[PDB]
Amino acid sequence: LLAEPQIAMFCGRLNMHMNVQNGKWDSDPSGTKTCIDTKEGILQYCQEVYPELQITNVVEANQPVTIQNWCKRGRKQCKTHPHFVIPYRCLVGEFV
């Protein structure tokens, strides 16, 4: 069983996303994406980290989540300090 696709942001640190395979929060694959302020940008990011999941929409999660290991550019200096944020669920779409 897989975890739910979602992304989490904390300005000043690279974006985090849910590794559906192991349920852990992983840092930005390219090591360059940080917090986004538009819904459209968030949807694009979901599509960027979950390229084959047909993500067509996004919505704020119901519960805040504490996440450790936030990194800075290049996925470097990943401190283990915890920061909790409200993640954005990446919603799979059904094409007709």
Side-chain angles (χ1 to χ4, degrees):
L1 271 42
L2 309 167
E4 189 187 1
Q6 45 195 133
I7 64 93
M9 314 174 292
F10 196 77
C11 298
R13 293 265 144 181
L14 295 172
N15 295 335
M16 292 289 250
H17 69 281
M18 178 59 69
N19 179 326
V20 309
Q21 219 279 330
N22 71 19
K24 315 275 85 88
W25 289 92
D26 281 350
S27 203
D28 184 54
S30 77
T32 75
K33 307 300 170 98
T34 177
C35 72
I36 300 149
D37 61 6
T38 63
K39 197 197 193 212
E40 287 73 18
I42 292 176
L43 169 58
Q44 295 166 53
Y45 189 59
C46 274
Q47 292 164 341
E48 180 184 341
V49 297
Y50 301 111
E52 315 297 319
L53 291 192
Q54 292 183 0
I55 299 311
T56 62
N57 202 6
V58 305
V59 68
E60 260 188 332
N62 307 259
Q63 300 270 168
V65 176
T66 285
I67 294 159
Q68 291 178 22
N69 311 313
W70 291 86
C71 310
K72 289 218 298 221
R73 181 92 189 198
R75 273 154 115 202
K76 116 296 255 26
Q77 304 167 50
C78 310
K79 310 161 158 144
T80 65
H81 191 271
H83 283 300
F84 70 82
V85 301
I86 296 267
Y88 265 84
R89 304 170 47 210
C90 299
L91 308 169
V92 172
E94 180 183 330
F95 288 98
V96 284

